[PDB]
Design a protein around this ligand. Structure first.
Ligand SMILES: *[C@@H]1O[C@H](CO)[C@@H](O[C@@H]2O[C@H](CO)[C@@H](O)[C@H](O)[C@H]2NC(C)=O)[C@H](O)[C@H]1NC(C)=O
Ligand SMILES: *[C@@H]1O[C@H](CO)[C@@H](O[C@@H]2O[C@H](CO)[C@@H](O)[C@H](O)[C@H]2NC(C)=O)[C@H](O)[C@H]1NC(C)=O
Ligand SMILES: *[C@@H]1O[C@H](CO)[C@@H](O)[C@H](O)[C@H]1NC(C)=O
Ligand SMILES: *[C@@H]1O[C@H](CO)[C@@H](O)[C@H](O)[C@H]1NC(C)=O
Ligand SMILES: *[C@@H]1O[C@H](CO)[C@@H](O)[C@H](O)[C@H]1NC(C)=O
Ligand SMILES: *[C@@H]1O[C@H](CO)[C@@H](O)[C@H](O)[C@H]1NC(C)=O
Ligand SMILES: [Ca+2]
Ligand SMILES: [Ca+2]
Ligand SMILES: [Ca+2]
Ligand SMILES: [Ca+2]
Ligand SMILES: [Ca+2]
Ligand SMILES: [Ca+2]
Ligand SMILES: [Cl-]
Ligand SMILES: [Cl-]
Lengths: 418, 417, 414
C-alpha cells in the first residue's frame, strides 16, 4: 500500500515538474524584456540641433522672368498655358510686376537649376535673423548651416557638421539657451489670388529640435511658431537604449548608407525616397542628398511628385526602416507670451525701420533651452537570462524529485545497458 | 565535536532557509508587476475620432420667442422674472432683437423640446466647415456625425458609428491628416450685458481626440483651439495593456452597459450620471443617451443641476469606474502658426464674402495628424509567477538542506510511526 | 571507460556551474532595478500650489526719486552718469516724469522697493474662482523671486490647509482673470541685457513641499488668451544607493521644513552669496542682511555668474526618494469674445484695446481624478540570488552548503 502512495506522489510530482519546467522554457523563448527608467543629473548637456524654415518657400521679390518660364507652373504663379490665373484680390503693383515678368516675348530662356532657384530666392538668414543669443553671448549667422528641405531653404543651428564643434550648455532655464528674434518677412510671401490644394494661408516658421546625428525632417517632425509671440521651448534630453532581435526590433548594426554617416530613422526614410526617385525618374529632388542630377520642373510635374505619392501608397514594404538601438530624443513643452510690449513697440519699430504694425505681424522670438541639467534614460532590459533559466529549472527539478543532470545521465546509463 | 558543529550548521542553515523561503512567498503574495515599454513601427495607422464643439452653445439668431419663453431663464437670456436684465453696454439693434423676442404679450406658447432646441439653435457644421481635407482629399460636412455634449451640438469626424469604416493614414506629417478651416461664427455668440455665473468670455472651439470605442467627454478631456491660428496637433498612438486583480485593477469582463456597446471609462462615467439623474429626477439631459424623456427647462432648474452637484460631493463613493485592460490612447503636442498671411487675408475675405476683421477674429485651421507611422505599447507584466516561485523555493531548499518535497514526505512518514 | 566520461562530465558540469553562478553573482552586484508604472484612481486629489510672476519686475508709476538715486543703475532707468538714456522712442510724459524724478538738485532697502513697487495682486486679479467658488487676493501668498514680487495660490504654508478638488475638468480648478498692467511696464529706450519685449505672465505649478524656481521651471502665459492647463499628478519613488542615486533621509535645511532639489539649489546659492559678498539678494530666504544696489553691482551678480561657471561641482544636490511632480498640457482660446469685449471694457473701466492687450485668464485643473505612480523596483533580491545559485548548484552537481562543508571535513581528515 505504501508503494502505491509513493508511486502516485512520484508520478504527480514528475508531472508538475514537467508542466512547470515547460512553462519556464516557453517563457524563455518569448525573449521577454521590461523597461528601466532612470534620471541622471549632469554638469553639462550637449545642446541639440535646431532647424527652422520660413513657411513661405521663396521670396516674391527675388523671382525672375526665367524662373517663371521654367518653374512657373510648379511655383503656382502661372497657369498651364504660361498665363497668370484669376486676378481676384491682386494688388495693382504686384499684378503689374508679375504680368511684366510673364511677358515671354522674344525671350531666350536662360539655363535653370532648382537648387540655384531655392538658394537665391529663399529667405536669407542674414535678413531674417534680427538678433541671436546663446548662453548670454552673441551668436553669428555663421552658426546656422544651410539645409535644403521640402519647405525649401532652411537653417540649422548647432548642426555640428562640417567640422564645427557642438555647443554645450552648463545651466538650465529660459536665459541659458538659444534665443533668436526673427523677421519672417511676410511682405515677401507669394500672393495668393486663386485657391489650390498647395495654397496655404499660414504665416510663421517651422522648427524641429533634433540630434546632430539625424538629418532634419521638418515637413513631418516640425512644430509651428507664430509671429507676435515669444515661444518658450523647455527641452528634456532623453537617452534610449533598445534591444535587438529576438528580444525587440532594433537595428543593431550601423547599416550605414552612402548618403548619411550615422544611421537614423529619418536618414533611412529620406534615403529610401532618394533612391526610389533616382531609379524611377533619373533625377533627384532639391532636399535629397548625393551626387545625382537634380530634377527639372517638367520632371517635377510629370514624374517626381506622382512617383513619391505612388511609393507612399502602393506598398510600405519597399521602405522598411528599423529604429537604431541608441537614440537621443529631445522632449519639449511649449508656452507663449506676447511680443512686443507697448513699452517696446516703438523702440523695435525704430530699431529695424519698420512700422509697429509690421513688427506686430512679423516679429517672433524663439527661446529653446533645457529645463534642468539632467537627462532621462529609457532602457529595455532582458527579463529572463539563461543563468536564471537554469537556476529556476534546477530549483524546481530539485524540489519535485530532487534529481540532477547526473541522475538523468545515470538513468540513460541503465537504459543503454538494457 | 563534529556532530555539534554539524548541528550548528544545520540549525543556522534551516533558519536562513526559513526566512528566505518566507521572503519569496510574501513577495509572490504581493502580486507585483513591472512595466514593458516598446515602440513598434507600422505601415498604416487607424485614424482616431475627432470631436469638436464651438464654445458658443447655440446661435443667437436661431433663438425664438417660444425658446425664450420656455428656456429663457435657463439660457441666461432672461432674468428670474422672465425680463431682460440691465441694458448697460448693449448695442441698440442687438437689444431691440432680444426685447422683441421676449415680448410675451398675447403670446400662445408652442410645445418645446430641449434636444430640438439644441439641434436647431446649435452651430451648424454646414456653416462652420469652411474647408475639410483628409489625406489631401476633400471631405463633406456629411462625414461629421452629430453628438450632443455639455457644450451643445458638437461634431465627430471619423466617428466610425452607423456602420462607417474607420479611416487609416499611410503617411505622417502635417499634410497627411485631418485639416479643416472653421469659422467659429463669433457674431452668433450670446450677448454678455450683465454679470452672471454662466457668463464666459472665450471664443473659439474645443476638441477631443479619442478612440472610436469611447464616447467624447469634451467638458473634461478637451483642449481649446483659438481663432486666428492654424493649430497643429501631433498625435502619438499609445496601446496600453493592464493587469486584472490581484496584480492590478482592471475590468476583465466586458461589463456591458445598456447605452454603449464597448466599455470605456468615459462611457462608465456618463452611464453613472445618466442613471443617477433618471433615478432622482426621472429625466435625462441632452448630452445623456438612452430612451428616457428629455428634461424640461423647469426640470433643469429645480432638479437636475443640484442633483448633479450633490452627486459630485455626497455620492463620490457611489460612482466607481474601473479602467479597461486594453486601452488605445492618443498623446498630443500642440503648436500654432498665424492665419491668415497678409498675402492671403484679402483673398479669404473676398472668397467667403467677409471683412478682413471678421476673418481675423473668426477663422481657425485645425491640423490633426500622426507625428510618425508608429505606436508605443505600455504593458503591465507580472513580475513573479508561480513557476518562478517554485523554482526559487526549490533552489534555496536544495541549497540550504538539500531536501525535496519527497524528502519532507519521508520525514512525515517517519513521524507517522 | 565509464568512470572517465563520468569524471569529464563532472568537470564540465562544474565549469558550467561556475560560469552561470558567477554570472548571477555579477548581475546581482550590478544592483539592477526596473520600472513599475501604475495608474491610481482617487476620490480626491490635493490641488497643487501655483506661483506666478509678472514679466515686468516693478511698476513705473511707483518708482520715486530716492529709488532712482539708490537703484537707478540697477533698474536700468538711469545710466552710469545718472542721466536718462537715448531719447529715441520716448513717451513725452514718461520722459518728462523721469527727468523730473532725476532732477538731483537739493535731493533704501531692496525688499521695501520690491514689496511696495511690485505689481499688487489686488489690482491685477480681476476675478478669482476655485472649484466654482469665489476666492480673495488674501489667498495668494507673497514670494520674492528673481522676477520680483510673485504670488502663490494654495501655498499651504504657515499652517494653511491644502485645497482638494473632487471633480476633474476645466470648471473644477483654479480660474483667475488677470490684468498684466502693460501700461506700468518700464519704458525701453535703449538696448540692454535686461531689455525685454515680452508681455504676459510666467507660471510654475509645483507641490507645496518645494519652493518656486520660476525663472527656470516656469512657462509663459500670453495676454489675450484663456490658456487651459491640464494637470496629471505623478507620484515618483526612487531607490537609494546602491540601486539608484537618491536622498533617503530628508536632511531638512534650516530654512525650509521639507527638502527639495529646488530648495537645495537656492540654499547653495544663498550660502555662496553670503560667503563671498556678506549679503543676500531679494529672492533669497533667511535672516541675513539684504544687499545694497552697490553691493549688487560690484559683488552679487558677478559672484553668482562665477559660481555658475567656475565650480559646478561645489553645489551637488541629490534627489529625494519621494517626489510629487505635476504634468501639464497647455491650450489656448481667444479672449474676449466679440460678444463680451464691450462688457469687459466697461466693467473694469478700460478701453477694448486695453482689454485686448492686458487681460488673460488662467484655468488650471486636473484632467481626471487619478494620479500616476512611477516606482523604481529592485530587480534581483538576495532571496532570488540564493534561489538561483541553489537551483543551478543542485542541477549541475547536486551539492549543498552542507556538501561543501563535508568536503572540507573529508579533505581535513585526509
Ligand atoms: C550605446 O551607448 C553606449 C554608451 O552610452 C555604448 O557603450 C556602452 O558603454 C557603457 C559604459 O558605461 C558600457 O557599460 C556598455 O557595456 C557599452 N555598450 C556596448 C554595447 O559596448 C554602446 O556601445 C552603444 N550601443 C550601440 C549599439 O551603439
Ligand atoms: C475711469 O477711468 C478714467 C480714466 O482712466 C478715470 O479718470 C481719471 O483717472 C485717473 C486715475 O488713473 C486720475 O488720475 C485722473 O485725474 C482722472 N481724470 C479724468 C479726467 O478722467 C476715472 O476716474 C475712472 N473711474 C470712473 C468711475 O470713471
Ligand atoms: C527704411 O526702409 C525702406 C525700405 O525700402 C527704405 O526705402 C527707407 O529709406 C528706409 N529708411 C531709413 C531711414 O533707413
Ligand atoms: C479590447 O479587446 C476586446 C476583445 O474582445 C475588444 O472587443 C475591445 O474593442 C478592445 N478594446 C480596445 C480599446 O482596443
Ligand atoms: C455678400 O454679403 C453682403 C452683405 O455682407 C450681401 O449683401 C451680398 O449679397 C453678399 N454677396 C454674395 C455673392 O453672397
Ligand atoms: C513615500 O511615498 C509612498 C508612496 O505614496 C508612501 O507610501 C510613503 O508613505 C512615502 N514615505 C513617506 C511619506 O515618508
Ligand atoms: Ca530673455
Ligand atoms: Ca522633466
Ligand atoms: Ca497645410
Ligand atoms: Ca514619440
Ligand atoms: Ca470656464
Ligand atoms: Ca493621463
Ligand atoms: Cl514579452
Ligand atoms: Cl543593468
Amino acid at each position: 500500500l505504501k508503494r502505491v502512495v509513493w508511486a502516485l506522489c512520484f508520478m504527480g510530482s514528475l508531472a508538475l515538474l514537467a508542466l512547470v519546467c515547460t512553462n519556464r522554457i516557453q517563457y524563455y523563448f518569448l525573449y521577454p524584456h521590461v523597461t528601466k527608467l532612470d534620471e541622471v543629473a549632469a554638469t553639462r548637456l550637449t545642446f541639440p540641433a535646431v532647424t527652422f524654415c520660413n513657411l513661405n518657400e521663396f521670396r516674391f521679390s527675388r523671382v525672375t522672368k526665367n524662373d517663371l518660364y521654367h518653374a512657373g507652373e510648379l511655383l503656382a504663379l502661372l497657369n498651364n498655358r504660361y498665363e497668370i490665373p484669376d486676378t481676384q484680390t491682386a494688388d495693382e503693383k504686384q499684378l503689374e510686376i508679375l504680368q511684366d515678368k510673364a511677358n515671354f516675348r522674344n525671350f531666350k530662356p536662360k539655363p535653370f537649376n532648382m537648387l540655384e532657384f531655392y538658394d537665391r530666392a529663399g529667405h536669407d538668414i542674414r535678413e531674417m535673423l534680427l538678433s541671436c543669443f546663446f548662453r548670454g553671448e552673441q551668436c553669428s549667422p555663421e552658426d546656422f548651416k544651410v539645409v535644403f528641405t521640402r519647405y525649401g531653404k532652411c537653417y540649422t543651428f548647432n548642426a555640428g557638421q562640417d567640422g564645427k564643434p557642438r555647443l554645450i550648455t552648463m545651466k538650465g532655464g529660459t536665459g541659458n539657451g538659444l534665443e533668436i528674434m526673427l523677421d519672417i518677412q511676410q511682405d515677401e510671401y507669394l500672393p495668393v489670388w486663386g485657391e489650390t490644394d498647395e495654397t496655404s494661408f499660414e504665416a510663421g516658421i517651422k522648427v524641429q529640435i533634433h540630434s546632430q546625428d539625424e538629418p532634419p525632417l521638418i515637413d513631418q517632425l516640425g512644430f509651428g511658431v507664430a509671429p507676435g509671440f515669444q515661444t518658450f521651448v523647455s527641452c528634456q534630453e532623453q537617452r534610449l537604449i533598445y534591444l535587438p532581435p529576438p528580444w525587440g526590433d532594433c537595428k543593431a548594426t550601423t547599416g550605414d548608407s552612402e548618403f548619411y554617416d550615422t544611421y537614423s530613422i529619418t536618414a533611412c526614410r529620406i534615403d529610401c525616397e532618394t533612391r526610389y526617385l533616382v531609379e524611377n525618374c533619373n533625377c533627384r529632388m532639391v532636399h535629397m542628398p548625393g551626387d545625382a542630377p537634380y530634377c527639372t520642373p517638367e520632371q517635377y510635374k510629370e514624374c517626381a511628385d506622382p512617383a513619391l505619392d505612388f511609393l507612399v501608397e502602393k506598398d510600405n514594404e519597399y521602405c522598411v526602416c528599423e529604429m537604431p538601438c541608441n537614440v537621443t530624443r529631445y522632449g519639449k513643452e511649449l508656452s507663449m507670451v506676447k511680443i512686443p510690449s507697448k513699452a517696446s513697440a516703438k523702440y523695435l519699430a525704430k530699431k529695424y525701420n519698420k512700422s509697429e504694425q509690421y513688427i506686430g505681424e512679423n516679429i517672433l522670438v524663439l527661446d529653446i533651452f533645457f529645463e534642468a541639467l539632467n537627462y532621462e534614460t529609457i532602457e529595455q532590459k532582458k527579463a529572463y537570462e539563461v543563468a536564471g533559466l537554469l537556476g529556476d529549472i534546477g530549483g524546481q527539478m530539485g524540489l519535485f524529485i530532487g534529481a540532477s543532470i547526473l541522475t538523468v545521465l545515470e538513468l540513460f546509463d541503465y537504459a543503454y545497458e538494457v
